[PDB]
From a paper:
For the first pathway, we introduced the p.[name] substitution to potentially disrupt the hydrogen bonding network of the R177-N111 backdoor. To structurally understand the differences in Pi-release rates between the R183W and [name] mutants, we determined the filament-core structures of these variants in the Mg2+-ADP-bound state at ~2.3-Å by cryo-EM. The [name] substitution induces a more drastic conformational change in F-[name]; residue S111 is too short to interact with R177 and G74. Instead, S111 forms a hydrogen bond with E107, the backbone of A108, and a water molecule within its local environment in the Pro-rich loop. Additionally, the density for the side chain of R177 is fragmented, indicating that the residue is more flexible than in wild-type F-[name] structures. As a result, the interaction between the sensor loop and Pro-rich loop is disrupted and a ~4-Å-diameter hole is observed, yielding an open backdoor. Hence, the conformation of F-[name]-[name] subunits is reminiscent of the arrangement of the ultimate subunit of the barbed-end structure. Accordingly, we identified that H161 adopts a mixture of rotameric states and that it partially adopts a G-[name]-like conformation. Thus, although the backbone atom shifts in [name]-[name] are minor when compared with those in wild-type [name] (< 1 Å), side chain rearrangements result in a broken hydrogen bonding network and an open backdoor, defining the structural basis for the ultrafast Pi-release kinetics of F-[name]-[name]. However, when estimating the release rate conservatively, [name]-[name] releases Pi at a rate of ≥0.1 s−1, which is ≥15-fold faster than the rate of wild-type [name].
Author numbering:
A (entry chain A), B (entry chain C), C (entry chain E), D (entry chain D), E (entry chain B): 6 to 375
């Protein structure tokens, strides 16, 4: 069987081709102790990865090796891949081909380093690197649609028509889940709550995933939150302290549609999707309007599909049928797509084997790369 | 039964001899993908022909193998004939004789290549190549008349008297439907509408076929369009956008009567018909005036028969009876004529069989050729 | 009943003996197609005769089998006789005796070929060949007179006295209707009108028969035409074009009296008649002067009898009574005479039967031949 | 000195009497701009004449004021005469008598308009209009011969004997160089070459003058061209494109001997010359056979004298000596003859002066007119 | 003196007629603050134009009022014209006539709005709107040539012959400098460089103008860049960071010759120029080949003239002399031409005065408009 590994900026999803869900989903973090050990006989490791770093985060500094979809620390990336293969999946990487994923418009050194590490450090027999938007389209059983994938690092709108990608129409919004976490940390100071460490950043991400939602009309929701108090929710911190948040619940996700809240000049995700559709030929825009596919963890806010539908309907001509496809499993769509791709009989010929890599080099790794 | 195939520059009309209408009418286009395919398992063919190329035109480059009645790409012409025989008519070309059509004054290599392809690629038992104007005269049940056939590539005026052709009086105007489509594309830029790709050219051809008409008096119509706004019509693009056109509606067909709008030096279709009549003997001009037969898709503009009548009446002596015959089925007249010709008992002896072609060669294909 | 057939260079007049007018009068022409037929199922014959050749003359080359009274094409002459017997009179030539006509001083091979064709091709029971001038004298009920017969091919003056012909006084002027048609074609170029084809020659003959007349005094008429414009007439061509002719109207017939207009050296018809009278014995000239009989289509110009009277009065002694007999039916006089001759009880013994022709041969055909 | 101006349908030849060659030979064309001028300060004239119209023909519509020897536009004819006098010869027309030329059997309004324009627009002191065939006979130093002059507009056969013209034997064939140019344009479409504009007509005329020739035996030459490829020649178009022509080289001039190629009913130039000789008296035919003089630019095809000799020898009795006189300067024979005529002391009394024209009018201009 | 204002999509060039260079050349941008001002007493304007917007671009959003040659914001266009007249030229627009420029095939509402604004907002006495290609031809001292003008918005090929425009042969390529800037931004992400804001777009345009060049052979240059490292150049960002670019230097301008790099279907600038030449009459193509004039800032890449020469030589017949005219001042050619045009004595009559505009309206503004 083949291994499917979706490495995002925030979470790593690993599993076996043919399955319907990732077997191992864990934070893509490396934690290192920031205090001196004083007790003899303690199994104090030098670093912690994933959930073990998340459970000991009180005495650790946590670092993401991937930032804005770009690997900034390849040693920590190798640590995370080692943890994936040996601790999470508990398999030998030299026995299975590995399907990895990457975002469009990424540096070529990224894919080249991934291939070099997979072939020289883990000694995988075969290997492939697929584009995440194409996999998200595989997961929904479509060959036409514009995929809006927003994870932890970056957001991308990729239009595909009848299996053909339109790379000139691909748009990138450098704003995703981690920026929303930082913005929530910033606006929680207005209520006197102070989160500053990396562990507190993990706490704020938990708050965001539990309590934040997308308002259908932002100004009406602001007026509602200012008038009464029915939007206030409570959250218990790990030390038993209880915080209460009101309009922040919908002010954090609103930065997805108004990036000026983050001091950014770019347009929201709705205008990004619309502009990506408008860069395509006039004859495919109608099919793209009816197949707008949401993907990633940042699209999991309650009410984001309705808000997206409303905004794109406001931007598009009135005769177009705007249809936002937001499946309940869209947090794993990429991985699911990868699974579907790695189980196709037609795909079993596109693996880059180790012999081809030894005889050609890093130039052969760019297969269906856009 | 015999197969009747009218191959024009724009449309292919195919059917069986004895029928009253073509069974398969489709655009004479070949579409090829201009983007890279990124999805595995998609039935991405190398090329598309006819309506399948028209439905996928968003990701295709469209090419006409025939330009100005001249085949510029014989491989694409064979693709179109294959699509005609196997996908549209769904017959075996080695079982039926084939009646093909050609315009007068065409290169002889055209007919020779057509015969070679029909006898060596499709292995047709018998084959004939008829002149399109004679077929258009068959369709109207006449033996005397001047046929003005204007399709997509070229316009021809062919006078025939009592079944005798006057080849010295045949006139050719290198201006037809595709030139009018290009001119409409050009003059739509005056309103800020930009159509540049081949798919947008198909869109503009649709606009032309739906909204354009021939003004009886051009300057009066221009004054009317400049004064009020009752001539303005709206058209919805495939992406839901709505464009509005005014005088363009009658400025595009006006190039048929004033080719100087296209930068051409030739005379209009009315003066071409009149000059073709005036090259004939004085004793047949009266019968030619009363039997001016319009044929082809470019004669399907509303008001072209009345304008033609008015112009030729202005050119001819006042005692002559100008009568423009414009049947409602004149878009298929050629094909209909071919049908009538291929069902005649007197014609069943004019088929060029494969034995005659093998024993003689390309010299035998010129039968009743003018 | 007997058949009377007057074969002239221009017209064939056929009918039954005893009638007062020819039943079938048609042009003595054979038309052959000069273009290629392109339509299947058309009744395109190989040749056309008479009025059917005249109606289709736009696509035909027209040929007269008789030129200057001499048959130049005996196959076309047989075609014309076949058309006469089967299409015009609609009789069986093997049931009726045939009275044919010939001009005086004609080659003997002409009469011999006529007899051979009538007896071997049409199998007529009896046959006779009469002289046209004697028949013209029969038509006027006279036995004395000088007949001036001018048809399409040749003009002849034949004096007859008390039923006796004076063959030594017979004069021939090789100038008749067809020469006048050619001269009218030539002088119409002075006004910019161009007639060149055989069909246009038929048009010019129609113009001549409708508009030309004989001026009583030629120089006075020329001065009148040069001064004012009251002599100008208009004529509508078959294609609706209108031409205007002035002095040509009387310049074309003037060549009958001044053959030098045609580059001919001979004398006019008046001097020819006078010289023919002066070759006769002095005792019969007075009776010849009073019985000058005009005959043929070329004597049908308005004012030719008055001009003839004036000229012959100027040539003859002042005591002679010049009387020009010009009956209104003199275009058919020959035929009428033939009718009268074929209904005489005294003539029913002069028929050359087929038995006499088989037992004697071509030598018996010269009966009353001069 | 006197001015000699030969105005043909195609070329104007102007010079001074006494010279041996025309000083100014230029195309008889008027060119008018068919596009709008967009640059300020350009010397954009309203019309161009002659070689200046030929050099700017890319942006001009070219018109011949003379068509088939008939002036269809007298304003353009005056433009051409003005260009002749002031730009080409650079003389004052009010100081020299002018000898003009005309074809036989031309409308009288032509000569009258020429005289009116020469006396009222250019104020010439004296003026004469000579027949072109008589001048061509002057150029060869003969008083007996049949001149076959074929230029751009019309062909004429004029027999002259001992200085006497036989106007009744003059024949006109409405087929010359321009018809051959149009026929070459038509038959070049069989090889896919398309020439349609007036500038392209000038290009085709250049092709005809460079590459066309008369085949001695037409069917043998057709067989030779069909078998091998030694008759193929190449020609470089003004834009650098190279066309190749084969049998067309001798199929275009063959229309001079087989006018049915042009859909014409008339006989070839050989049969026209023979028929013109046969209309003359029997005593001068022997001298006419030995003095057949070719004249004009259309007689400049290589091999036309030999073909003419062969055809007329086939038509004439075997005891006659057929001699075709084709001098190498026969393109200018008319002009040369005019020069010789305008330098004769006996001719200095035949000038029509302006006083005679004022006292008599247009009636005096017909001097030796036939 | 007259004012000459060349308003392009990217730069505005303003000056006085008679000068040899524009006095004021500044970016055609309007910048608006995207942050809130917090300091009292700061001269914080509402908007910035030109160089003042370029110097403060760190806190501004920059907008081009012209996009693809089409004015999308007329208020910002008026702001730019006001900045031109009062801040750059420092003149009163009500004292000088203004010569403006426009691209061919532009919407008529563009010229009408320009005239309305110049006559009602700035109250100019006279005004004219010239075509930019004609001005570029004025600047080179020619009346014949095909101008290929590529600026920031659109590329146009306009052939002119002897001062006559051939509007039917004008071609438009919707691809110019701004598309190349966007493509450079896109391909700089392959090296990990991220430029997303409008200020960063200005930075990338600076990089393009400093480091990009046209490779003579693209594949050989790609092989050279892949092998060694001699093509790598460095560029210092405004914050002191240094980026290094290699093949991008010639991959960005290569989109001018291979628009498929941008996902466009159109042909390159070389094929566009060749097709524009081939739409002209055959007689002017030779002069157009020798006078191909480059114009605009997008033609300022090193090596574009040699590449253009090579490509057009490959497309044209081998006997043609391809000559690319690329003067060193071709970035201002249009303006220079305008200067030359506004100083001509012949032009001082083509100004549209305010009285004519008040008495006629927007219909009079179309003078020499094509
Ligand atoms: N229910 C939820 N609501 C809002 N955001 C969520 C939810 N679940 C996950 N996220 C956010 O999704 C982001 C990463 O999700 P994922 O699609 O795995 O991204 P990546 O592929 O970059 O790892 C995180 O920033 C996380 O905060
Ligand atoms: N209703 C219509 N009005 C105007 N033009 C039409 C109409 N229908 C078809 N056409 C034009 O007719 C042209 C081709 O018609 P057709 O006679 O099939 O030509 P061909 O024989 O060359 O294929 C096309 O350019 C199309 O735009
Ligand atoms: N009304 C008329 N006026 C002048 N000529 C006429 C008239 N009718 C007939 N003709 C001429 O008479 C000629 C032939 O008449 P016809 O006596 O039948 O001759 P033929 O006996 O040779 O056939 C024709 O050339 C025709 O032009
Ligand atoms: N060398 C040549 N071969 C064939 N045709 C020629 C040649 N030179 C000239 N011509 C033809 O001669 C014609 C006109 O010649 P010219 O005698 O000047 O006629 P015109 O007197 O009517 O001007 C033109 O149509 C031209 O094509
Ligand atoms: N040296 C250079 N090399 C390449 N491109 C240049 C250079 N200088 C200017 N440009 C480009 O030219 C474009 C605009 O130039 P210009 O001719 O002024 O256009 P416009 O007339 O539309 O303002 C800009 O996109 C700019 O990037
Ligand atoms: Mg992801
Ligand atoms: Mg057709
Ligand atoms: Mg008779
Ligand atoms: Mg001549
Ligand atoms: Mg510009």
């Amino acid at each position: 069987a083949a291994l499917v590994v979706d490495n995002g900026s925030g979470m790593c999803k690993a599993g076996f081709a043919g399955d319907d869900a990732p077997r191992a989903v864990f934070p893509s973090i490396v934690g290192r102790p920031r205090h001196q050990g004083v007790m003899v006989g303690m199994g104090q490791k030098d670093s912690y990865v994933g959930d073990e770093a998340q459970s000991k985060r009180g005495i650790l500094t946590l670092k993401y090796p991937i930032e804005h979809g770009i690997v900034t620390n390849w040693d920590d990336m190798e640590k995370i891949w080692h943890h994936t293969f040996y601790n999470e999946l508990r398999v030998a990487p030299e026995e299975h081909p590995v399907l990895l994923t990457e975002a469009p418009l990424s540096p070529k050194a990224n894919r080249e380093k991934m291939t070099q590490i997979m072939f020289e450090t883990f000694n995988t027999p075969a290997m492939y690197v697929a584009i995440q938007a194409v996999l998200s389209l595989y997961a929904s059983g479509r060959t036409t649609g514009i995929v809006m994938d927003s994870g932890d690092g970056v957001t991308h709108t990729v239009p595909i028509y009848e299996g053909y990608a339109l790379p000139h129409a691909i748009l990138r919004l450098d704003l995703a889940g981690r920026d929303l976490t930082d913005y929530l940390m910033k606006i929680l100071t207005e209520r006197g709550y102070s989160f500053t460490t990396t562990a507190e950043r993990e706490i704020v991400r938990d708050i965001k995933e539990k309590l934040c939602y997308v308002a259908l009309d932002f100004e009406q929701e602001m007026a509602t939150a200012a008038s009464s108090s029915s939007l206030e929710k409570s959250y218990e911190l790990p030390d038993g302290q209880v915080i209460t948040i009101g309009n922040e619940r919908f002010r954090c996700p609103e930065a997805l549609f108004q990036p000026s809240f983050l001091g950014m000049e770019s347009a929201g995700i709705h205008e990004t999707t619309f502009n990506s559709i408008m860069k395509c030929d006039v004859d495919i825009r109608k099919d793209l309007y009816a197949n707008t596919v949401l993907s990633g963890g940042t699209t999991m806010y309650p009410g984001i599909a309705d808000r997206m539908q409303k905004e794109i309907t406001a931007l598009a001509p009135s005769t177009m049928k705007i249809k936002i496809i937001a499946p309940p499993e869209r947090k794993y769509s990429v991985w699911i797509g990868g699974s579907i791709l790695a189980s196709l009989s037609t795909f079993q010929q596109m693996w880059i084997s180790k012999q081809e890599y030894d005889e050609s080099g890093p130039s052969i790794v760019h297969r269906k790369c856009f």
